[model samples]
Target chain A: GPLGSMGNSGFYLYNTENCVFADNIKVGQMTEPLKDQQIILGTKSTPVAAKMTASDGISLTVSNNSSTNASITIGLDAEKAYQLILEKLGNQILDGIADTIVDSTVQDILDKITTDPSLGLLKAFNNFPITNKIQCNGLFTPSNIETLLGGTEIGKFTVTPKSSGSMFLVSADIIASRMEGGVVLALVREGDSKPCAISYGYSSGVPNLCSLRTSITNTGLTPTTYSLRVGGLESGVVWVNALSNGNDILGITNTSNVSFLEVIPQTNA
Target chain B: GNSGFYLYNTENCVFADNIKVGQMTEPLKDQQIILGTKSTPVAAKMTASDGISLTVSNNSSTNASITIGLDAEKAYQLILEKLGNQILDGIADTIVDSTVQDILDKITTDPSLGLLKAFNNFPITNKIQCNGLFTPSNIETLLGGTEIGKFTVTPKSSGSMFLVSADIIASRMEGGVVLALVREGDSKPCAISYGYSSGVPNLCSLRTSITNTGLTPTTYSLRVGGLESGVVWVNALSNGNDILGITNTSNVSFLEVIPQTNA
Candidate 1:
């Protein structure tokens, strides 16, 4: 049954109970309500969807760069609308630079960099090769001894990296000669006793010259120090070489240097 | 049968596009009953395509637009205002959830689409190669300081440093073997190593870091010479020395070190 404005309520076309619009309802003007309820359109035979045109100034895209599952996107082409949006408000829509973000409560979200650096203008470049520095290098050596295999200290290198994965390229020339004992050099870290890299000097009852070179990588957060220690395995003398005098036979020059490099493999980027 | 406004046209009395009276099978193009042009900017406007949409653009002092139906935010605003105000009394029928959600979703601004991808979002495959070189090319052994071995180092950039080290080996019972890293004209060595080699490998490691010397990309000859006729053998034996082929890969190489928070 049809009903009019009863008491103070607005006009009603039909009964308050079980009222349904069987046909399409056209209104000249409407203040559409934000209904909490979901609305259903068209049956399978007569399905309906939004069609875009030149006048609308917006397009419907299935997926834009990234997918949105099974959803429709309503937006003007970002590049095309950029000029229009930029022309009106100007820098007022922006907050600041470096931050590189803009959020208009009534307009567009130009750019943002919150959690992800890539999303922003400036990126988190954690691996690009930075300035080079000499960690440690000199004509120093651990004075070799013909005694036990572990106690003489000579040259020590301490590297305090600003970050981890730092590599120190090291090379050393050592001298050892003995009829009964073997020369052993240990590259020991500051705290630990064991050597990460070692130099086993070969002796055939006389002094012979040889060299060894290797690299070490730092994984610790704090500073790590590697000291050069020379000793004998048994009863012979083990010595590291350096410049003693002119034509001197037991010294090393600038050739025995340790270059500081990154911890990445020797390959092109 | 026909009760609504209908225009009778003889000689284009009114140039109307579509006709709809009681019930419309198909909707008219959105622009209808417009009092002002798109440039004029009206206070409020309503138009219907498939679904009705209201646009409030260039209305106030600025060109700020408040759209409804055509877009999600506007549709949301329209629903919020109209539904809240109209529901003086509740309706009796049960509205379907999935259908309205699907329709509104079209008007909704999707979360992922048109989004700016973060740095982590991209697969970082770029890396850097160190600029460096090795000495004692091939396996040739030098008998004396006459010829020795020759190498040239060009700094990748200005204010760079170089690490020079060497081991002098004597094939004979040479009392003392002396090897030095020196430039072409200089009488003295930038770095030098000296030791006795009695047939057995006498390991002599001399380390020197050459800093603030050469300009960037400046090519210069690096020569290794010995005074007492020592054997300069980068050529190594199995047990004592590393048989690893090249000095660059095996022991000495041009490795790059970069430390920071890391980009």
Candidate 2:
């Protein structure tokens, strides 16, 4: 026996018996062959950075060389990275508004004045409110210092005010003597010791009880004294306490009272 | 070494120094091994495009990009055609359109547009507000000034107006120079300086907040004059009320807009 070699259209073959040619010239016909469309590696291999990385897939670092000195290493933790980016964006949106900052400043003033009038962002703005009560002589005399400006001076007070403006809430209870002349109370601003503005109260009828209510406009940037006085149409006398009907134990009439409030405007800066 | 024309493996190994087997050559099907380096990168330029480029930069750092970039609109358009539709195809076979619409409703419209525009469209950025195009002997002209310094803003949605402004500072002068903002499509400037005068501290900020309601790309320019075009020179006559020069420190701040929020 001898080994033989043979060929056909499908493939070439070798006969183990003989090394010579086979008796049949061909065995089969040729067909289409396969080619590689996708890479199939015989051994698994990991890609290296220099070999196969895109811009977003690698580590990077950037730094400033100036005296301000800063640097950022840009490798990331997935959890913190997402949270940090989203949180930063949220803050940027909220804090971007200048109007909000301005309105917040005003709101801070209101909230402070509401909770405790003493504590507020606008505390430095001398918007103080003051009140005082006093008993004065009911007799209108040329010797009365309050009578010099307009009405006979009954009460006076001093306090700092809001720059925008303030108001004087004034009131007085007058008991007239058994006389004909009725008297009216006046609230006045003491600018140069003069009545720059005036508010009048109800007139006291002859021998009867009368109450007065009037709010006067007040304006100033700082604290200053103000005056209240009484004057009437025609001349007469008024009684504070020494009524003939057992009203005074020592004839010391101190019942008729005068009081007022110096209140700052809510629009104070 | 060689027997007839044979294709066989030698103990699970195959090697060939040089040979040709296929009759015709065609483009790579799926994968290719491009031996690119930093100095000689694989580069491609887009024809009939405004400087679009593509490159595979195989340097010490592996980077590749195709750019001269894109705004959010065009970028999302490409992404939808290339990747979004393929993903949708896979899901449509196994999912319902009602469920897909629900997935879309999760993304509220306002904030989604904001997210698209925040990084790309809304606020234009720059290093300085310098421009060499402004010619001398100019009047209170509000022209774009033959390629003057201008801002480009393209709003993504309707009813989105913006506050456009720049900070201008002068070195020293005793006259006046305005840095007024004027939009291209408007008849008059939205906001103008009273007159950027030397009487004030040599600095002024002007706002030309445009009510650009239509979804259009916009151009904002400068008008450096007063109402009387020639009466108020862009820069004042000799020792008058005007700025002598503008500096590099002056720059556009940013666009202020009513941002779309989740609320």
Candidate 3:
């Protein structure tokens, strides 16, 4: 039995041995197209191109002082010069010269703007005096806005008489990062000067900050009939009386010397 | 004001001196045994024996039968003569059975246990047809054991005259295996007989059908030959033929069958 072999077989038989001829139907292959023509004809259409435009670029520039105006123009391709202006004026205030004892209070701000590596001519101009205060306004055109707005560089300042009154325009660049805006400064008498109101105006476009002919009130001062010149300009020697003790006075001289000090006025006065 | 202990609210705070102690202060002492009074008691004694009466009888039958219900693919080993008396009676008569002697010689001609050394004297190459056509599909050496067929058979004749045939079991009228189908709608033919240990010229039976719903119709032929079955009682162990019962027929016997063909 160890040598015995095994075998298995399977069978399926469909016998049609008995049959009378009967009518039968047979189905064969159908003749359909290999590809779907209708799907090809219904393909989606191509889409149209999107539209775009290339316009001239522009930037904003500030005046030599903190005030702003829009009448000035700034160059689109003057990036190197623009960077220089930012290095000179960014985060800095040029109230006055550092050498002047009164100006030392604001000297740190002036030094930061002028000595920064990124600022250009503004750094050079800030090292010297502004000469005259009258020819300061309206000089900040787009092409020359940087020179006027960067640092406390009022390239030229001159006094001009308008129909309303006399005003000063320091048309110098304020070394700003944005659009060219005109700069305006308020002039007040330090210590004792009657009629202690701020005198301010803009010769060209009004700035986003303070608009043209904005008024600054003279509070905490004794009323006195004193003649006032615009932008730290005084008709010779103007005097205004102080009404209270320990009053802080902020004023700039024609030579760009801005002074800030607290004064204890005469108790009798 | 006097108050409970509080930590100072300063940059840094420092503690001065301290001491750490061991278990000497614990309640249990080092010199005590810690015992309690008895809750119960016990005792014992010894002695010896004597007699009574009983009755027993002897059996005259030549073969005995036993039924075993087994799950599919499960294996079982038949331990011969596990009881000493039963082992002696099972093999005593086989030494004189001439026909069994011949079958044993044909299956184990080379004397290597019960393994056949040759097929038709051709050294038993891969397979040999003892009762049917031989082919690779028909038989193979699987795991060093030769599986001939599914039926376990033992004959009371010479191997030349009577072969253990499974086909005979499937077709015979008496002591034959039956293969029947019982469909879901039928009630009469639920059971069928499979001669798992049909003796002498009869092998076991196997049945397979395709009853799954929606399956393509399938019909398979059944094989009934080519298997080895035997008992291993010491005195009369047939070489390859199955020993369904011992010499005394009262002792435990065994039958083994393997699949000879796949369906």
Candidate 4:
């Protein structure tokens, strides 16, 4: 519109109708300004290492905090870095074993031991209880195999029979092979509070697994048969060889009629 | 019933301890004294620091009673105050300053007296209170002359104020000289190796004759000895010419001077 005829009009551009331009200016004051406290984008503004060394002089050495292999210029020296990695990895592996691996193994063993009735029964046998007293004659002896098989020897086992009391005993041979040393066998009853009066002979010569033997002589005024029970593993010793040789069973051979208690027979009312 | 009152034809009563005739016939049952056994009453009462044990008795509705016991109020108040005061006294001892109190008193009243504040105190009373004076150069100069005192300055970014003392410069005016100009390593000097001097260049004799000059005498020179022997060389007028010689003078008195003037 204002080509060469602008000389004739006072407001030359006023004759122009529709004209638009693309431009912008920052408007009113901002309510919140963008944060300027970081050197790297989205990173904290820390004193640069150059600034630290410049201010603190040549003697200053800035320690790096990164623990990875290629962290600092010198990193950790080769041997030191290897040592650190091995130490950390070793600790982590041990921690995993203790927290997850070994813990589960121990738990599984305990759970199986608790739930399996047969295994539980075997454990119970480890704590087997004894019940009943027997007699010593030309019949009973104590040895490891006899104790495991519930057999006996002769003159080796004997006890003075108290009227209604009970006595219990195990074979020395079974004790030597299957039981802990210095094992004590007790004979307990419902009301008689005190149990097992006679003790096994000296413990010095006891084997790892051995058997216990009992013999009762009816010496009181009343002819009474006292009940008895056998419990626990026999003395701790090596007894299988002694059993095979048959050299140690003093006298008794068979272990029958070892009753825990005498039956009160029925009579005419 | 609407007025919250119950009308009874007979008067209610409670027979405790023993029963009497026409007295409601309440008997003191030795074995069965308990009205309710093995059951507790609802909403029982308890107290602080008091062990709980209860005794119950039966009575008619009109004869029920309750009793309470507690420590006297005055005794309790005294105990609480004593405990509070003990804690307060410890706090006061830690935060109170007797030296600051004295300085404050002096500044308020005595203008002529010289006030020497501790190194820890500054920015007091809106004035630059200092052990000596204020100025970066003057502080350094004053510290250079003082025997006891040190200075530490904040970095330029810290934006803090500090002070310096003035008496330090006046204390270091004693005149002296460097007796021996030997470097780091040199041989030890002894009476047998080197002769004493009387105001002869750097070789001033430290001892003198007991004189009648009426002036009190003092050995004004200090002997500096025991330096490393590697990097030291001694040049003396040996046999006429200023001959330089290597000697085991690690223990040589390096600097010795007498107070020629007090300035």
Q: Estimate each model's TM-score.
A: 0.34, 0.28, 0.10, 0.12
Q: Candidate 2 at residue A225, lDDT?
A: 67
Number of backbone-clashing residue pairs for each candidate, in the order shown: 53, 17, 50, 74
**Which candidate has the highest DockQ of all?**
1
Off by over 4 Å in 2: A1-84, A87-111, A114-151, A159-163, A196-207, A210-212, A244-254, A257-269, B1-263
DockQ per model, Cα: 0.05, 0.01, 0.00, 0.00
Candidate 1: list runs displaced more than 4 Å. Answer: A1-82, A96-182, A186-212, A216-269, B1-154, B167-174, B182-193, B198-200, B211-263
Residue range A170-259, candidate 1, lDDT tens digits: 444444334433454556666664556555455554444434455566575466766666555433444333221122233323223332
Candidate 3, Cα interface RMSD: 71.8
| Candidate 2 per-residue C-alpha lDDT over B1-263 given as tens digits, one digit per residue, 9 for 90 to 100 | 22223332211112222111222132111122223244322322223132222233322122222212222234344545677545444543333434434434543244334321210111111122222222333333444222224666666445555645443432123344455566676665556553333322223345555555565566666544332322232212223332212111233433324544446
Q: Lowest-lDDT window of 10 residues in candidate 2 chain B?
A: B116-125
By DockQ thresholds, what CAPRI class is model 4? incorrect
Give the per-residue lDDT of model 3 (tens digit) for B1-263. 12112223321111112111122132212111112224211111111111111111112111111111111111111222244344333333332244334543554343323221110000001121223322234333111112222211221112111111111111122232232323334433222224422222222232332222221221112222222322211111113322212111111111111223457
Candidate 4 per-residue lDDT, tens place, A27-73, comes to: 11111111122010100111110111111111223344543542212
Report the C-alpha lDDT of model 3 over A89-187, residue by residue, as the tens digit: 433312221123243223443563445332211211112233232322222122322122211222222221111211111112121111222132323
Task: Report the lDDT of model 1 for residue B230.
Answer: 41
Q: Per-residue lDDT of B1-263 in model 4, one digit per residue for the tens?
A: 01111212231211112221222243223212112223321221222243211222223111212222222343234544578356334533333334334534655344233221111111101111112212234222222111111222211111111221111000001122112111112232111111121111111112221111111111211122111111111122212222111110011111111122338
What is the alpha-carbon lDDT of model 2 when measured against the actual structure?
0.36
